């Protein structure tokens, strides 16, 4: 039996961002994905211009109503959200998660709190109470606890403070460590009982590829649904992101080499061992 | 260098149809896909009810304008279309193909002519003049030449008549052969110089899975872009569709087992040799 994730993110026709970065890696790992596209744009916004449009917040919920009407919502094992442009879209995600958990009480919500008036406020004040897992980057974690974080102890303490508000797991998808060499890319994952740090090479780019955070959350969600332990899912995520970003760097590209490097999403060749962060 | 296909088809959030059937298999085979979603529905229409909506025809072209504005249209190696609900959407596909070929004269258009007033007429009267390849099923082929087809000779003759109008290749994605056993599923591919017949087992279903034709066209497009000969692309398509439909049948499912059977999209275990159809 194949697991199912409802992924509620942006769609771009060209390139990779949002669902265009997240759906294929999760499928390639062996998990089904129901992509609810909150927008359809020609390309991601870091090119500086794009065409297309967003669906409205009520239409998001209506799509999930349709899935419910054909009897499929109990099959949803997880909900994943990432960048949302408006608080109205975030409210629809809340409504959708409630509907999914009513149909399947075992379902969990993985909120990647990517940070219009009200959207930072929504992610900080409201989403922790409904998310089973959150995946902030370093600056998003600082906003979630309302203070600066520069040590590993401060990072773990902050994650545990956020966990006390509801989430059972915090994935710091990029951790800044003032004591770490500048050519290393650090990550951290924390639960009530566990804390794991990990590190991969940082590849240099003139402009940062879009979608690395979306890929990170997607691989972690898929490996978790496939039954990995916290540490195993974390290490596979670190290694898979390493493989894709390395391949992007090696080819001198800007858009992630997701299709070209797909074998190493599923079976990364270069592995990085996590270490105890507590 | 990875090839790129612009795939202009429906999107369904749950299940597989249109781009939800076509995008993942092409990516899994090693080709990039730019999905231009003509609609976003909750699920495919053979459940009998759905929610969601279509984008308008002008918005389709505007998405491609955006890709052109960031300089990417010369990278498009093929355009793929399948089911279109309105002649206005079909006209937008025509406009898009013209723009793509202006940016890249080597690009080709693969029209799966899935058959509102005017859409059969458009596919029969207008699309042959612009499509480099068409993938009708048996009844669509009969409509394209305006007569009944029951022998293999009649099928090859009909394909060659259609080729004389413009297309260089006709993939009959399901060929009805009155002389073939009822538990066989036949296909045919014809060019000016070649004709290949092939056959796989027909798996019995209470209701036919949606997306088999979309999967067929997608695998054939991807294998062609990867450099396969006509016969090689045809055989890989036959074997990959066999693998997915067999896995769907074996699990007693209705929606195609695309993710579960993905290894056999790329490397089918059971192979069927084509034979000369001329
Ligand atoms: Cl950060
Ligand atoms: Cl995909
Ligand atoms: Cl038919």
Curated annotation (Swiss-Prot), chains A, B:
GO cellular component, as recorded? cytosol
Q: Does the keyword Magnesium apply?
A: yes
Cite the Gene3D superfamilies for this sequence. Answer: 3.40.1190.20
UniProt entry keywords in alphabetical sequence: ATP-binding, Kinase, Magnesium, Nucleotide-binding, Transferase
Which metal ions or organic cofactors does this protein require, according to UniProt?
Mg(2+)
PANTHER family, per the entry: PYRIDOXAL KINASE
Give EC number(s), comma-separated.
Answer: 2.7.1.35
**At the top level of its lineage, which domain of life is listed?**
Bacteria
Gene Ontology biological process: pyridoxal 5'-phosphate salvage
Protein name (Swiss-Prot/TrEMBL): Pyridoxal kinase PdxY
Q: What class of enzyme is it?
A: transferase
Role noted for this protein: Pyridoxal kinase involved in the salvage pathway of pyridoxal 5'-phosphate (PLP). Catalyzes the phosphorylation of pyridoxal to PLP.
Listed binding positions for substrate are 10, 45-46, 214
Q: Which terms in the Gene Ontology molecular function aspect does this entry carry?
A: ATP binding; magnesium ion binding; pyridoxal kinase activity
Per UniProt, what is the name of the gene that codes for the protein in this document?
Answer: pdxY
The similarity annotation says: Belongs to the pyridoxine kinase family. PdxY subfamily.
User: Is Transferase tagged as a keyword?
Assistant: yes
Q: Could you tell me which pathway this protein works in? A: Cofactor metabolism; pyridoxal 5'-phosphate salvage; pyridoxal 5'-phosphate from pyridoxal: step 1/1
């Amino acid at each position: 039996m194949t697991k199912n994730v409802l992924s509620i993110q942006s769609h771009v026709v060209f390139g990779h961002a949002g669902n265009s970065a997240a759906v294929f890696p999760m499928r390639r790992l062996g998990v089904n994905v129901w992509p609810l596209n909150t927008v359809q744009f020609s390309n991601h916004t870091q090119y500086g211009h794009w065409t297309g449009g967003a669906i409205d917040a009520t239409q998001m919920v209506e799509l999930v109503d349709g899935i419910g009407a054909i009897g499929m919502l109990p099959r949803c094992d997880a909900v994943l959200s990432g960048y949302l442009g408006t608080p109205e879209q975030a409210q629809s995600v809340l409504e959708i998660v409630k509907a999914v958990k009513a149909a399947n009480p075992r379902a969990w919500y993985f909120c990647d709190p990517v940070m219009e008036p009200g959207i930072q406020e929504f992610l900080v004040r409201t989403m922790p109470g409904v998310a089973d897992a959150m995946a902030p980057n370093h600056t998003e974690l600082q906003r979630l606890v309302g203070r600066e974080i520069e040590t590993l102890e401060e990072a773990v303490t902050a994650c545990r403070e956020l966990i006390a508000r509801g989430p059972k797991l915090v994935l710091v998808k990029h951790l800044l460590d003032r004591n770490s060499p500048a050519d290393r890319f650090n990550m951290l994952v924390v639960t009530e009982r566990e804390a794991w740090m990990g590190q991969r090479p940082l590849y240099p780019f003139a402009r940062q590829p879009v979608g690395v955070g979306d890929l990170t959350s997607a691989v972690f969600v898929a490996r978790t649904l496939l039954g990995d332990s916290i540490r195993a899912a974390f290490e596979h995520t670190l290694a898979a992101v390493n493989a894709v970003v390395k391949a992007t760097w090696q080819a001198g590209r800007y858009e992630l080499e997701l299709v070209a490097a797909q074998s190493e999403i599923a079976q990364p060749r270069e592995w990085f061992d996590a270490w105890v962060g507590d």
